[PDB]
Structures are given as structure tokens and as C-alpha cells.
Amino acid sequence: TQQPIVTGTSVISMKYDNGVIIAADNLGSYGSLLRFNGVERLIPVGDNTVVGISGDISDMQHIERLLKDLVTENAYDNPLADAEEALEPSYIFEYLATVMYQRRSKMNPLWNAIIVAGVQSNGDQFLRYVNLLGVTYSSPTLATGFGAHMANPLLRKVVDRESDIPKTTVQVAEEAIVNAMRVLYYRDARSSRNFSLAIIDKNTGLTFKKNLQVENMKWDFAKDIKGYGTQKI
Amino acid sequence: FRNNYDGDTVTFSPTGRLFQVEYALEAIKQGSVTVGLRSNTHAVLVALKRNADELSSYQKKIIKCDEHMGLSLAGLAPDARVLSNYLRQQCNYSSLVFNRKLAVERAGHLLCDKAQKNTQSYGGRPYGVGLLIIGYDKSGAHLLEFQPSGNVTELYGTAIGARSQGAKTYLERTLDTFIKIDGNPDELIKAGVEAISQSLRDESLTVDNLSIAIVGKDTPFTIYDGEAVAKYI
């Protein structure tokens, strides 16, 4: 029985030929007050997974804690903790899925939307979503909040179906991701310019970039607009 | 002496022995014989089933815990049920909550912890059955030996029950050989049967008499009884 307070906006992601990319900005909004400007919302779990979270920040922070503990406790009496019995993206996701649906069923949800992106032991990309109601689904592209509306249409023009994944490059993909991010800054009143991006490639492993910014902005055209119809100057 | 310190599991003898636990271990030595042995690709269980009359069934000694794990019992059957049932639940939980096949090593760790509670708690009673556990997982084949004392050990092979020592020595020599039986199920089984025959005296192992179980790479834990073990005598 709650109501989010400090929040974070979209998280966008897509999977490519040899990995997956995911991103999210660094803002913690308090209603219409863009309150916190240094909030990482992309959570790296191990070396093959990043979980992006949007929704109530306090619950996110709680999920951060749950994730560290999940790691700590997998090391326990596990000789293969840094290998064959390391946390796979699917394990992390199914755990989180499970928790979300249990909290919704108790009527005390974790007010979030989460995307778990990563690559499995055998090389398969993994990208899936779960939210405050325990609804889960997967697609070559995935986004939460505004990103579902704006980013998905864009990200899908690159990967419209499964067969397109093997034909898509990191460069293509990352380009897309950054554009979508730019778009969102233009049309989402709750976005911020600063963001974090992360790629999880079956070869390069996990690359996590911090402090990216939306650039190449088209605002120049604003000068030729005056009034709202009949006004001349 | 003994008669004073063997009243329960919450009493240590003046030597530092736990008699109730020790007495528990004895019901195992009273049980029929079973053997386990693993190569690098499969793990087999061969167990001699024991009838009560020539007019009865041969007590089932092997139990499937998951598609990837199972065990042969030696001793008090009920306690076997209680324990395998627990092994079934923990396997289920891993699948459900993490979508992860339970690590035999972990299954081991869990069994030890369960028995131990009945070896330091009042009015409780140690379990009276030993268990041979085999399974294939993310790190190959495994065989685990469980004792009511709470001690669990992973071995290339072993045997328990009455006259177990026969097979246990047999395998101890046969090691260099069987551990190399990769990709050939029937052979390991054979090796198992031979080993099991090393602890015989009664009569030769027959149809109603034998019980074998196998798990491996592309082989789900399957139970072979009677009509199907014929080719292995």
C-alpha cells in the first residue's frame, strides 16, 4: 500500500549479435523537482549482468542490497563461485521476478520496473523485464516508462525481430541507444542529460561507461518561432 | 560407562563421543549393500535390494530427487524418505526461485545441516540411514556419501551397508580404470555391478535382487529395476 516518492525514469535496452546494451539516466526526481543528479540506476552484478531499475529509488536501493547479498551468499561454500557456479543473468532475474510477484501478492510492492540484461555462460544474450506486479516479458529491445513509448519504436527499427540480432553491431546498437536517450531528454520532462550506459559482450565482457551526456542537440530552429498562430514577430 | 552416557544425543561421553549418533551409524551397517562410482561423464548407483521372505518385495533403495540428482539408501527407510523429500524440496526451490539446477555440492551441504540438528537437540534422534548421492550438473558428475553423524563426503566411488568393505576396497583398486569410463554408460554400470558383487555372500545378484540408477551428461536420472538389469549380471 505505497506511493513512490523519489523516482528514476526510463531504462532502455536492446540486444545485439554478441551482447546487450542498457542505459538509464542519473536522476532521482521528487515529483516535478529534479532533486538528485548523481544517481546510478544501472546495477552491475558480477561480470555478466547489469540490472537497470526505474521506479521508487528507496526500493531500488533496497534491491541493490538484495543483489549484493545474493552475490555474497553464492560465494559461500561454493568453490566455483568465480566460475561454473557463478551467478548467471537468468538466476538473478528469476530471483528478482519472484520477489516482485511476492511483494505484489502481499499488497506491498517494490515500486519499480526492472530490466536485467546480460549474457549467459554459453554465450546467449539475456534481456528480460519484470515490474511491481510481477509481469515479465522479453524482446530484442526493452524499455520502461517513456522509453517504452519513444525508445522502443526507434530501437526496433534496427532490430524488428530475432533474426536481426545477429546482423546488428555494437556500434549500430550503441548509436541507437544514445539517440533514444537524446530523444527522451527532449520529450521527457523528468529526464536528465547525464546518463550511464553499459554493454555486455560475449567477448569483451562487461563494459560500463559512466558520465555520458546527450550531445548533437538540435535547438537552433527554436529562433524562427514566435507566437502561437497569428503573431508576426 | 556407556549405559550412562548413551541416553540421548545431547550428551557427550568422557571420550568426546556421541553414542546415539554412533548407535545410529550401526543401523546403516545392518542394511543391505549399495555402491556408487562415477566416471567423468556419468554416476551410477547399484544397490542390492533386500526382501523379507521369499514371498515379498525387495525394499526399494534408490530415490530420484530431481532430473539431475538421486540417491540410494542404506538403513532406516523412513528416515530415507524424510531426507530425500527434503532433497526434493531444495531442488525444487532452486529451479523455481533461481531457475538453477541445484549443485550436488550444495545438496550435500544441505543434508549435513539437516541431520546435525538431530545430533545436538533434545528429544530428537539422529537419522538412521546412510545415503549415496549421485548427480550431474554444471561441473560434471558427482557422488556423495552421507552419514547420520552429519558427515558428507564426495568420492570417485564407494559403498555402504553390510559387507560394504568388499566393494569399497574393490573400487579403491579399480579406480584408475572406471574413472576413465567416459561416454560408455553400460560399462560403468558393469563396473558398479562387479563392485557390488565384492560384498556378497548370500546368493548371486538377481532380477528381484538388483537395483541400478544412472545419471549423466545427456542422461536424466533414471531408475532401472528387474526386467531391465538382466543384461548387467
The full set of domain ranges for chain A reads 1-233
Experimental technique behind these coordinates: X-ray
Three-class SS state of B210: strand
Q: Is B98 in contact with A94 (Cβ distance < 8 A)?
A: yes
Q: How far apart are CA B35 and CA B145, in angstroms?
A: 10
CATH architecture of A1-233: 4-Layer Sandwich (3.60)
> What is the residue type of B189?
I
Element (H, E) at B212: strand B210-216
Which CATH code is given to the segment(s) B1-233? 3.60.20.10
Nearest residue to B160 via CA among B202, B189, B130, B188: B130
Which residues, in sequence order, are CB contacts of A51 under 8 Å at separation 6+? A42, A43, A45, A63, A67, A92, A93, A96, A114, A115, A116, A117
CA distance readout (Å), A229 to A151, A221, B73: 31, 17, 87
Q: How far apart are CA B22 and CA B55, in angstroms?
A: 33
Q: Is B139 in contact with A90 (Cβ distance < 8 A)?
A: no
Residue ranges per domain, chain B? 1-233
Rg of chain A in Å (alpha carbons): 19
Three-class SS state of A206: strand
Alpha helix positions (H), chain A: 57-75, 89-105, 146-149, 151-155, 170-187
Q: Is B96 in contact with A85 (Cβ distance < 8 A)?
A: no
Give the minimum alpha-carbon distance from A102 to chain B in angstroms, rounded to a whole number.
11
C-alpha angle B178-B194-B131 in degrees, rounded to nearest 5:
80
Q: How far apart are CA A189 and CA A154, in angstroms?
A: 19
B94, closest residue in chain A (CA to CA): A91
Query: A with B: how many residue pairs have Cβ under 8 Å apart?
Result: 30
Give the minimum alpha-carbon distance from B177 to chain A in angstroms, rounded to a whole number.
27
Nearest residue to B102 via CA among B70, B73, B131: B70
The reply to whether A207 belongs to the active site is no
Q: With both helix axes pointing from N to C terminus, report the angle between B185-197 and B165-178 in degrees, rounded to the nearest 10.
A: 150
Q: How far apart are CA A86 and CA A74, in angstroms?
A: 7
- The answer to whether B73 and B49 are in contact (CB under 8 A) is no
Q: Is A95 in contact with B97 (Cβ distance < 8 A)?
A: yes
Q: Cell match 536501493: residue?
A: A61
Instruction: For an interface test with B, give the residue of A91, A102, A128 to mutate (most B CBs within 10 A).
Output: A91
**Strand-pair category, A141-143 with A11-16:** antiparallel
B100, closest residue in chain A (CA to CA): A91
Q: Is B98 in contact with A80 (Cβ distance < 8 A)?
A: no
Beta bridge partners of B154: B144
CB-based contact, A69 to chain B, within 8 Å: no
CB-based contact, B154 to chain A, within 8 Å: no
CB-based contact, A94 to chain B, within 8 Å: yes
Q: Is A77 in contact with B105 (Cβ distance < 8 A)?
A: yes
- The answer to whether B143 and B155 are in contact (CB under 8 A) is yes
Cell matching residue B199: 560384498
> What is the DSSP code string of B41-66?
SEEEEEEE---SSTTS-----EEEEE
Q: Could you give the count of Cα atoms lying within 13 Å of A148 in the half-sphere of its Cβ?
A: 10
